[PDB]
From a paper:
In summary, our study demonstrates that PH0208 protein would function as a purine nucleotide dependent R15Pi enzyme and not as a homologue of the regulatory subunit of eIF2B. Monomer of PH0208 protein consists of an N-terminal α-helical domain (residues 1–122) and a C-terminal α-β-α sandwich domain (residues 123–324).
To verify the preferred molecule at the ‘AMP binding site’, PH0208-WT, PH0208-C135S and PH0208-D204N were crystallized in the presence of both AMP and GMP. In the presence of both the potential ligands, AMP outcompete GMP and binds to the ‘AMP binding site’ utilizing the similar set of amino acid while GMP binds to the ‘GMP binding loop’. During crystallization, even a higher concentration of GMP (4.5 mM) as compared to AMP (1.5 mM) could not aid GMP to occupy the ‘AMP binding site’. This further indicates a higher affinity of AMP at the ‘AMP binding site’. Evidently, when both AMP and GMP were made available, AMP binds to the ‘AMP binding site’ with a higher preference than GMP, while GMP occupies the ‘GMP binding loop’ only. Binding of GMP to the ‘GMP binding loop’ involves very few interactions which predominantly includes only the guanosine base ring of the GMP molecule. Thus, it might also be possible that the binding of GMP to the ‘GMP binding loop’ is an outcome of crystallization artifact. Both, AMP and GMP bind to PH0208 protein even after the mutation of the catalytic residues (PH0208-C135S and PH0208-D204N) at the active site pocket.
Residue numbers in the entry:
A (entry chain A), B (entry chain B), C (entry chain B), D (entry chain C), E (entry chain A), F (entry chain C): 3 to 324
The structure:
């Protein structure tokens, strides 16, 4: 198959986390299949079908934990597959793909703004919010509360190994919002002064569990200890279909040198392993609500979100498979 | 008034954290008064006395949180005051200061060894152990349990902002102990494979609370959630006497440039604050045992230690005072 | 603009709490629009419509917390709006308002009876039951369980500041049920002899939280500490729709003279504030079941009730609005 | 009135626990109905109808706690009844009974196989599983996981008084799975080495509570204590529809001779009562997931299984009733 | 025996709670025995011995729950008894009693001031303190923090049935301290804004339990839920000797009409009992510290306080017994 | 080397559990030492000394977990050793052994009687008590309470594998106390009707943990869950001095034939391991009080029992050692 440059560049940048955030990763995965359909030089429908099959697979094997990525691919290729199997001609396939792909990106953008408006109603004036990592959705909520004229301060946790909290601190601060930057270790110490916790999701499971950035479960734990509300801002495509039939989510182990730089680690003894999980799993009992673009749920209603939007596809194979 | 440079240098190095760890800071300050005494050029007792008080004030105003420091100073200066007020001559006073400092240092070393001997009995063949920061007393326990031929593995938390875990990791490796190095955030995620938790203490309070490196309380919190024993390895001079009469322990707020380096921090907007507590406080309900040189205690028995060894001095002002 | 006195009197009495309890307030407001419609002197639909909206605004601005009230108003006014905008003539509109109000009142009465029938099955012969405030729906359950020949005894909390428990106590006694009357403070002390807890609800939220009379959350808290079932007896019109899209329920702050009578309160210094929340919020983790007219649910299933019966109206403004 | 031998045998074998396990009981009840219809000497529809009614009551009045039994009888008799009231002739009605029984029996075996497939995905290589009693659904999960190449070990609790664990241990051993057998008392002692708990259910209620063999709640409680996942393997016919309308599940109290043999018990004093509850009730807060043949649910979603598969029948009487 | 007027007046006023507060009750009990020794017209030592024996018994049978009362009597009569048994003449007995009695009252007064100074060190500037009932000792702590220039607000709970909170609110407010008065039911609702809880004791037990005003355990419970420190301000004579040898403290049941006034209650049905426990028992795990006049303890160190100050007397009969 | 028959019998009877219960074991060990001295044919002091050393080792190497045994041997052999090193002649040394054994045996019986007296005060009229295994100290508490006229009922858990509960039930029945006998699995089912839990101890550690019959921790855990008091009835020789210096108590693993009889076990597959821990370890957070003959303590005061009664011996070797 004749895969375009942009499909491979996008895959590289997902692996390397130059492109990161589960929402963004997913939009970018959709963008890539769109560009493959723009520039494809294929003559028949069945050539193009095959390019998009292979482009999808390239994109799926980049980073495993955020289901947002495969839900973007599925959004485009369920539609592309249906077109092809009902004998769409070539230009009818090229459009299905381009259009499905634009549908997903626009609905993503709209969902986040909507999550912002909903979640902000749960923020009270004077609140001190503690967040983790960098999440566009969590930030939509905090940003929207500030624009409503609520006076808020956000406690940004640093989020090692990759320092995501620096992006968050600068982002919120540039909107006018006062920020307090602290280390991940200081989360319990400042939980007493915290009124709310607002964080993202990479995968939400059937039973209510949230996979998000490493350290998320600690903040959640001690939030429960102190009765601070834990609010997970998360789009419906963060919800994980395969968990309905009993799959556990893969937790991405990233390279040791994101923790200890190569120049430093090569000097350390052989009997020190460095372990770099990218994500942990927060149980549902530590979660007050999940703010989706369709509204507030208890985390145990994740099963409904999946029943009604995703369940149907589980009897079929994946839409990029032979 | 005529204070030697070794006192001034010890101070500077305690502040900058070139000299660090509660016990070592204590030994360094004992040592500093020793050198003041050896090298003093005083002719009268009153003149040496005055040097020994001023040197004590300089050493005590360095770092507040770890009570080891003022306890070392008191061990020396109670004995210096008793001698001076009982009419000691110049050389009897100089030797009282010197010999007292030596007793403190010697007892500090013996206590850490004995703590290791005692704590090691609570480590079992096969144990995965999680620790935090760098604690001589904690390491002593792990080192001895290995030396007894137990096959242990230690999970070492990175301990930001100052990366104390690097020190711990390299040291444990160097005695032959396999290490797993993780970010602080990952402590709950790895608590399910952990069997024991073993950390140090900077100050231990009347009611059993352990003030220790920032993040300690999170590790204990989730340790307890999981039923993993939390064991604090701690010398009797870590116990805090002022807290018998209601005093709260000051928590050191250290320079923000330790968190975010100067060169970068000055590029950030005014409306980000960086906050950097060097310690947090862990409740007694989350501690299984404290391991002192005199044996295993439940945390609530902190008060006995304080009664029988320290309470006598609480009717009197500090032995360095005018 | 030409509003009858029955609407004005119903309002005044809802405010003063002469008419009180979530369900009864709802029925009183349905009834108030009914009388507005029966007695209206309008010639045009537009003129009646306008009376029905203004009367609705007057009734809704009385007391905020209990969602029963605006739910009753909507039951009537959704149907009035649909008729008016579909071109109904004066008398078709008047009858739509009147007949809708009647359906609400009739359904309210049937629901409380059925709730009693359902809840009673969860009461067992011999049960000591603790309750709080005065709730029709809660009493219905206790009354029916007695009527079935179960030998129950009810602990009745006094419920300050308004002494709601006196009402509950006299009423339960009058059906033949032995009562034990205690101050609110004594609820933990008597929780060890309690078998069941049965209380009402003013608003139930998207995530399962029950807003109810002040003190409810304490009784549930210690009920849970003790493993005593907490059962909330509540009509579907107690469920709060705005909370699907992030709205927090306002908690009524009532006059301080209800706490400390006027004559006494004016003798007190300026620097005492009296604060008087009429409700508190009980988390879903402390609730065993909610008992509605449609059956037993776990609290987290609040969201289903809200979805299938109320969410449809959340794209539209209130049916009383200009 | 003309009930075949086979029905009376099934009933006796169910009461004496010669046939046992919730699913197998249900399959035996349907088998009996199937054999009543096959061998019936009834001449008219109304005569067969009456034999089946009576068979169904004989069967329902054997053992109360496991609802799998009445759900089997309902499955058949709902269909048999809908035929009879439509005016179905004799051989038409005999086939509704015969075929509905076979549908139930086949779907049962299919459901359990699929529970195995789904629940096995939650077992990870290396896992140690604690189980309780003898559940065919739980065993399917453990068997499948092992067949996938996962090296697991199973802690089989003995399950007094009927010694069920001996059956589970022998069985699992017979597939090549290493079993650790321990007494019920030791569940907490070994919870620290358990990774996963997997058990059956006799009845699952509307709020998520699980009724299973006596002991089950203790194992769930200490599992929650230690953060081990509790996974309930349960066919959808284990869910209890009467609970939707407030019913409490009856806890079968069986003979004291199953605890203390007749020989020994008769010598004991009169003032020793021997109580033998066959089941207990685990709350949903201690259950991570229910594995059904339609998927994984959080325990709070039990109410949906019921709304959507059994809720329709609650306005009618039992099908075997007049 | 010729008991003076003031012994009987004091007993009456303890029963009626005209004199109340455990410290005050005890000082007043001591005052009474003092006055009996002032005014006694007795000729021999053995007459006087007998008057004080009988005066003590009159005072002991007034209110049972606060051990402060009998510890005051014991303080005077251990001394009086020792005098008499070593053959003190009459004036030597009259003084022992008068003087012992003044010793107790002065040490009481001094202990409270000292509890104020200790406990205030645990109060931080800006703190919002929630209290219960009226306790001189709790107030000493809060009063002393305010005089130190810490800016504090106190949340006074009303404390039914007897309204103690009115005395507290007026008292604190008259010292300049801002007060918030709320009902006992509002304790959890305002626990989120509370930094510290400071309360009294009537009896502290060997194992750490605090008997204090009804409702105390609820505030403590929800304080633990929210991680607010519960500090019990309490003199060493609040500690309960008989608990060392396994006695449970009697919980005083006061007359129903303190709850519902006589004019009102006489009209209520016969099947309503009104239950008025004066006190409840807070377990030690909900208590952070006990501030005694000898300093801060964990509640589990109550056994030490009793071992060293009280243990010795338990092998002897009570000092007012024949 | 010349060890009498009686010592070898005691040892065998201890290993096979023909003599059992921690106290009774200890009394049997001292009895053996007493009989070794009485019947000794030794001519010199050093010869008797040597028989006693060897007897003590034979006895100590029977069963490890219950420390009552080594504390008995220590009581005697500390005294026997202090005599021998003072130069005591033969008949002087024989009497130290004989008399020290009798001192221990008499004080044991006295301690248990006094535990009964003390612990009975915590039983209230009406109480239902759950117990576990067969403890003479626990039984003393239940017997005394009943003898005081309190109408109690006792839930006797069966205590597999050795069926201890049958002994407890028969015994208690024999004093006229109504017993409910239940299997271990049912402890949580009946915890809701239990008012009080009362059990023994084999070893009590320095931090308060209680080692008792397998199952004990499950009963403590579900008791804590339901706020039932857990009361441990334990002689002061149950406290474990090695634990002061970090030692962990060994958990005796006994024969698999005590779980599954030899006849049956030999037929089973090789791939079923049967594990029989005889004890488990209850944490101090789940224990309300330890009832000793010197009084009630909170479990955290165990360290004082030890400091003040056994702490002296830890700098020396065992008395029976060379
Ligand atoms: N890898 C995973 N995939 C899906 N769900 C998980 C995974 N790990 C944990 N969970 C769920 O998330 C929660 C975390 O529980 P625990 O592991 O006990 O903290 C539980 O509900 C688990 O069932
Ligand atoms: N600065 C401090 N000095 C002494 N004790 C403290 C300090 N801060 C907290 N504590 C104690 O440590 C524990 C921490 O409580 P929490 O507020 O639950 O983290 C409590 O037991 C307090 O008594
Ligand atoms: N005003 C409110 N409106 C709606 N939900 C609320 C409100 N206040 C609290 N909650 C919810 O109710 C529960 C109370 O939480 P806590 O703050 O633990 O008492 C949480 O589940 C919140 O989601
Ligand atoms: O989709 P949004 O809300 O922006 O963020 C969702 C989550 O995905 C991210 O992972 P990574 O940085 O890609 O590894 C972060 O963990 C974040 O909370
Ligand atoms: O001794 P002080 O600290 O003043 O108060 C101690 C306690 O005694 C009181 O009881 P009551 O009003 O006599 O029934 C209150 O409960 C108060 O907390
Ligand atoms: K907070
Ligand atoms: K673990
Ligand atoms: K109860
Ligand atoms: K585990
Ligand atoms: K707070
Ligand atoms: K109970």
């Amino acid at each position: 198959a004749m895969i375009v440059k942009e499909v491979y560049e996008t895959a590289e940048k997902i692996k390397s986390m130059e492109i990161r955030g589960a929402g963004r990763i997913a939009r970018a995965a959709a963008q890539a299949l769109m560009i493959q359909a723009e520039k494809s030089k294929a003559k028949e429908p069945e050539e193009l079908w095959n390019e998009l099959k292979v482009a999808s697979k390239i994109l799926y094997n980049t980073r495993p934990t955020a289901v947002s990525l495969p839900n973007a691919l599925r959004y485009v290729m369920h539609r592309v597959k249906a077109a092809y199997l009902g004998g769409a001609d070539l230009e009818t396939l090229r459009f299905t793909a381009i259009n499905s792909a634009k549908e997903f990106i626009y609905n993503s953008e709209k969902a986040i703004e909507r999550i912002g408006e909903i979640g902000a109603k749960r923020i009270e004036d004077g609140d001190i919010i503690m967040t983790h990592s960098h999440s566009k959705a969590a930030i939509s909520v905090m940003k929207k509360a500030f624009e409503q004229g609520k006076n808020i301060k956000v406690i940004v946790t640093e989020t090692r190994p990759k320092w995501q909290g620096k992006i968050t601190a600068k982002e919120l601060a540039s909107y006018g919002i006062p920020v307090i930057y602290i280390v991940d270790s200081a989360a319990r110490h400042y939980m007493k002064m915290t009124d709310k916790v607002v964080m993202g999701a990479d995968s939400i499971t059937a039973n209510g569990a949230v996979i998000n950035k490493i350290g998320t479960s600690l903040i959640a734990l001690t939030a429960k200890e102190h009765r601070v509300w834990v609010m997970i801002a998360a789009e419906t495509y963060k919800f994980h279909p395969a968990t309905m039939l009993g799959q556990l989510v893969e937790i991405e182990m990233r390279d040791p040198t994101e923790v200890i730089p190569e120049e430093e680690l090569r000097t350390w003894p052989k009997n020190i392993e460095v372990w770099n999980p990218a994500f942990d799993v927060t149980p549902p009992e530590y979660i007050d609500v999940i703010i989706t673009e369709r509204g507030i749920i208890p985390p145990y209603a994740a099963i409904d979100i999946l029943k009604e939007e995703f369940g149907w596809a589980l009897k079929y194979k994946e839409p990029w498979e032979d």
